[PDB]
Design a binder for this molecule. Structure first.
Ligand SMILES: CC1=C(CCOP(=O)(O)OP(=O)(O)O)SCN1Cc1cnc(C)nc1N
Ligand SMILES: CC1=C(CCOP(=O)(O)OP(=O)(O)O)SCN1Cc1cnc(C)nc1N
Ligand SMILES: O=C(CO)[C@@H](O)[C@H](O)[C@H](O)COP(=O)(O)O
Ligand SMILES: O=C(CO)[C@@H](O)[C@H](O)[C@H](O)COP(=O)(O)O
Ligand SMILES: [Ca+2]
Ligand SMILES: [Ca+2]
Lengths: 675, 675
């Protein structure tokens, strides 16, 4: 049949791509081709408009199987061709060894690190539910799309997928349909060696619906029926168990050897001849397959055309909601939204930056509907919920509604991070955030790095940033954390010192379109600084206190800026004149002009950094570094600062030693380099 | 009764400790005191010998509840007193806000970061099973101890505990008995808001046995009976559901407000009077409670005395095993074990450091019985299993035996990391390791940081260290990872360049008693270096190529040392004389004498670092840094190196620019500082 021919075409494109690269993973593509064919035939999508907001989304969570995804995209006429398949895994190609949303048309997210994609799918589905609750009206199903996810055994072993699956079941996300490639083979061999749990029983315990397809190597009728069944269960996410043979058709089918290496050439020949293809030919695309797939594309394009007319009619019937929706689909924030950001003066009271963050959120959430977010069971500590908002919950619970804006993630940092990526991936200008303690952002490093690589504008509201948290002690006090994330490409790491800087940090985080943000916020109160403003802090680094005859400049962040200002006064009594630079975001600063940066960190003056955590990275901006390169302590925070000499006198002593160390030396800016 | 009085004493000590600190968590201690009393009465332990190898172990995974643990330790006469309880959460005390194994007698592990302790308990139980299988003989139950773990709802939400619980069920760890504090309250309020899964059904799906105690606020008879029942089920770990009221007895019992803040003074008064205590008194310890607890201690000490005689008789009956066991309990490796480490010369073939690591393990595992380890489903890629070893599995599976040495962790990096901590915590000189790709060590950051804080000598075998892995692409290629872990206190991060350096890295990792190791290893082949040795590499950094008239020194690690040596030859043709330093472990280097370090990185010469990942940290050792501060690419590895100019010519160009940049300048060692 043409369907059988399509499945063979998919299988053979994937195997031929792996063969051409002499690298990659043929097994899961061979096993999952029937399911991929069946699912894409049920999906609504436009290969010529990858951003249609009412498309069904597909996520390949088992990203190593990407030769399968690329084959589907090529067959359906996305902006990806057989010539791109021939360049699978080759430097600079559009067919990298794991899918990248920035590079691959039709890749919704970046997968490859196991466990992530299913969580991303939870986030896409969460966003779709929130979006539909916000915009749909009687006779106006603006959003009614599904989220389809393929996943393997490795994904099911990773704890992040358990977190997201527990939460998705709690949230009754009925438009999520996941498919488990139940092939009983991982890299170490049989799943009997390490993975003998009853997966189906576990998913039932989370509140998922289950459909089992016992012969998923061939039974596309049953796979299609499973999708229909899943669509009838509107209050549970569904897991479809696809019992497959890894490498189906290969001489080496059902073995670990077909997971992750190219097939032998003789194996590929017998595959082709068993399926009616020419064993002398590679990258074959039968025209009948193209015709069949084109018919589905044409039907989908008519569906999108009708959706566009529905949207036009919606804008007439619901003028304000329609304009809001249009603005969001154009990727634009509300005009002058930032006028809602709070502004402070030096006469205002001292406030913890966690509380300043609460106040910002309270002002901007009512003004910017595309902001949603939550906390990982730290709502009353992170201060992440605006008063007067309702939680995102299924209405059946009585605890919220899908129109809600605040997500109770539970104690699930890693899944929160990956769900945030999925919410961003949904689109519609979502600007979403997640709160935890800064030290526990590290639990989510797998997802955070993918936010950076995927260029998603997500925001971590990361409170309790340092030893300033006090009594909870060294298991809670960050040391390495900002160095880790600052060393990751494309992460804005804001550590605001005061009210104006906190508003600048949020301005950056909400305006972002391609850069994730981490906001490192304090438990303890900090004073409003003389010299701070949103304008200056928006440059990432700025001169807080200018001293034309400076003997030293102190560069600091966060809670240490006020410390530096106090040290300047001690130094004045020692006959040393200091300037102060505040560096609330190193990435934003780095992006400023060379001349701007040199105006902040000039030649001809020693520069000392002060920040109560690792000194890594700080030599970019300073000659000497005063930091904390050991673990913390359990005690009242001011006593810990005193112990480690993060006091005005301790900073002054080190500043004076710095001045003395550079006596008789020629000093150039830390910004200078040889290459 | 005296048991009732003991429970009240525990509750009130915990509440009074929180009150004195005006900080901490009274709720779970109040709810769990009956269970703590019952479990400690069943446990075998010696407060005067915390390291007795056949003790039962207790782990408080819900570490915020540590006022409960400290109260138990004080009542049982560990080296912790009521005066220490009065200093709960105070700077420098023995009663920090979360338990620390380095600081607190009777704290087996460091908990506080949720999810970790249950995984640590899995590791303690895994080690006990392996240890018993290795040493027990007929009439010689050298090891027969249990592992008791308390955990809360937050622990059950964290994905790491799902990973470890799936694995523990697979491994049939019948001496693990965990207790869930089923109080339905977390920080964000009711568990109905985010945690509605059927926990018991999930644990059954993992192959755990379940006991439910419906009235755990009072029914210590049922808690004791649950332990007896769990001990009869020898092939399944057991979860005991303790249905409790958070803050039991408080006016605010059953509310989130009692989770994490001190009780009101009037509340504490009514607690005391309801339980027969003096509301005017704090830190009361009724002598009858002390007497009761002392009787159990005395009985346990007689049990240990008998164990010591059993051990003496074992050494007579089994002389070789007995001497091995004695050596391990003394914390000593086999005499001259390191003579098994492979040694290479520059005439030997190029080898990937992953393969060199395989070869080391193959030589040392047969010589050092206390080495065990595994991989997170990457055994044939990490090369972590010695040929001729058997896997650690329950014999009932037919797939291994508990005497086995190789653990199939599955795709569970985070739990692997926390299980490794538990294996180390067991003691008996275990030197245990875990393999994954370096980029996915990041999935386990929560546990890795705790290895460092807890001072456990665990080892990560972290292969595929860079863009040198090639085609899998940027989702797999580390950039930030070594900076992250190097910035963490107390982590040795070895990046060996060749065979001799790889042997030095293992010498360090296996000899370690207080410092975790990460071994960053290559996919690709590297040459054996002229000038390397175990002796020199054991210093962490050393002069590989000495040049007395150097214009520049190039400092490098791993795969970039050979690159630096090739660049030296290009530079010679440009009239520039270079030296080369190899820096296989920055931590070990830092610990050398000032004079040694200055012999490697002298004054008076520019120093350029070369390492194909983040430049963070490198200014400690260099004036200029050539690194990779962007994400990688999917392609053949040599083409990626060429793209980023990590070539002999690219390094030489930057070296020449460095020499030119310092012309006419006075240069001092990067090791110098102002303070
Ligand atoms: C173990 C591992 C894989 C086995 C999958 O086994 P699986 O899901 O059962 O896939 P299969 O049916 O055999 O093709 S892929 C690559 N990876 C290394 C790998 C490890 N950890 C993380 C976080 N991401 C990864 N990418
Ligand atoms: C959420 C959070 C807690 C709630 C526990 O809730 P729970 O287990 O149900 O405890 P309970 O019965 O209410 O006392 S503690 C502190 N913590 C912050 C916290 C967050 N993430 C990590 C990894 N470790 C933590 N320590
Ligand atoms: O991490 C934990 C305990 O392991 C939480 O219970 C925190 O102790 C608490 O949220 C801190 O509260 P505040 O810092 O907001 O007072
Ligand atoms: O991470 C994955 C895929 O996401 C594994 O399948 C690796 O691709 C494989 O283990 C690399 O193998 P070698 O580098 O040992 O050839
Ligand atoms: Ca599989
Ligand atoms: Ca609880």
């Amino acid at each position: 049949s043409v369907d059988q021919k399509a499945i063979s075409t998919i299988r053979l494109l994937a195997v031929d791509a792996v063969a051409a690269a002499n690298s990659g993973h043929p097994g899961a593509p061979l096993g999952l081709a029937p399911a991929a064919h069946a699912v894409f035939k049920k999906m609504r999508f436009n290969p010529k408009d990858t951003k249609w907001i009412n498309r069904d989304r597909f996520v390949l969570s088992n990203g190593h199987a990407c030769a399968l995804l690329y084959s589907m995209l090529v067959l359906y006429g996305y902006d990806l061709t057989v010539e791109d398949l021939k360049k699978f895994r080759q430097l600079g190609s559009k067919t990298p060894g794991h899918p990248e949303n920035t590079d691959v048309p039709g890749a919704e997210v970046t997968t490859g690190p196991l466990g992530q994609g299913i969580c991303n799918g939870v986030g896409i589905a969460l966003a779709q539910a929130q979006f539909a609750a916000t915009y749909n009206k009687p006779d106006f199903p603006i959003s009614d799309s599904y989220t389809y996810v393929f996943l393997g055994d490795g994904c099911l072993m990773e704890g992040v997928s358990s977190e997201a699956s527990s939460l998705a079941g709690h949230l009754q996300l009925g438009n999520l349909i996941a498919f488990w490639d139940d092939n009983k083979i991982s890299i170490d061999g049989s799943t009997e060696v390490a993975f003998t749990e009853d997966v189906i029983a576990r998913y039932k315990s989370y509140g998922w619906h289950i459909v089992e397809v016992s012969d998923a190597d061939t039974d596309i009728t049953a796979i299609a029926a499973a999708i229909d069944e899943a669509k009838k269960v509107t209050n549970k996410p569904t897991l479809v168990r696809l019992t497959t043979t890894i490498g189906f058709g290969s001489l080496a089918q059902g073995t670990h050897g077909v997971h992750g290496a190219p097939l032998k050439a003789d194996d590929i020949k017998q595959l082709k001849t068993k399926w009616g293809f020419n064993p002398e030919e590679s990258f074959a695309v039968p025209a009948e397959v193209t015709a069949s797939y084109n018919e589905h594309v044409a039907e989908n394009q008519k569906i999108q055309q009708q959706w566009n007319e529905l949207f036009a009619a919606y804008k007439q019937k619901y003028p304000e909601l329609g304009a809001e929706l249009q603005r969001r689909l154009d990727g634009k924030l509300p005009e002058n939204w930032d006028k809602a950001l709070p502004v402070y003066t030096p006469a205002d009271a001292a406030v913890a930056t966690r509380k300043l963050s609460e106040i910002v959120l309270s002002k901007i959430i009512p003004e910017v509907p595309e902001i949603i977010g939550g906390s990982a069971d730290l709502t009353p500590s992170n201060l992440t919920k605006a008063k007067g908002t309702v939680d995102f919950q299924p209405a059946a619970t009585g605890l919220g509604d899908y129109s809600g804006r605040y997500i109770r993630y539970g104690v699930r940092e890693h899944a929160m991070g990956a769900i945030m990526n999925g919410i961003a991936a949904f689109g519609a200008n979502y600007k979403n955030y997640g709160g935890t303690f800064l030290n526990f952002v590290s639990y989510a490093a797998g997802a955070v790095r993918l936010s950076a690589l995927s260029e998603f504008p997500i925001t971590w509201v990361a409170t309790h940033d340092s030893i300033g948290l006090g009594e909870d002690g060294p298991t809670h006090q960050p040391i390495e954390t900002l160095a880790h994330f600052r060393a990751t490409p494309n992460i804005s790491v804001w550590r605001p010192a005061d009210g104006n800087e906190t508003s600048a940090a949020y301005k950056s985080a909400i305006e972002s379109t391609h850069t994730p943000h981490i906001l490192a916020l304090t438990r303890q109160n900090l004073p409003q600084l003389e010299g701070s403003s949103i304008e200056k802090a928006s440059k990432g680094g700025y001169t807080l206190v200018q001293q034309d005859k400076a003997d030293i400049i102190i560069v600091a962040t966060g809670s240490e800026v006020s410390l530096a200002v106090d040290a300047l006064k001690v130094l004045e009594g020692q006959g040393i004149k200091a300037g102060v630079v505040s560096l609330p975001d190193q990435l934003t600063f780095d992006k400023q002009s060379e001349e701007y940066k040199l105006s902040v960190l000039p030649d001809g003056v020693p520069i000392l950094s002060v920040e109560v955590m690792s000194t890594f990275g700080w030599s970019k901006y300073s000659h000497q570094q005063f930091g904390l390169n050991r673990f913390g302590a359990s005690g009242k925070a001011p006593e810990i600062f005193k112990l480690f000499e993060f006091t005005p006198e301790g900073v002054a002593e080190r500043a004076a030693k710095t001045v003395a160390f550079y006596k008789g030396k020629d000093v150039v800016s830390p910004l200078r380099s040889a290459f």
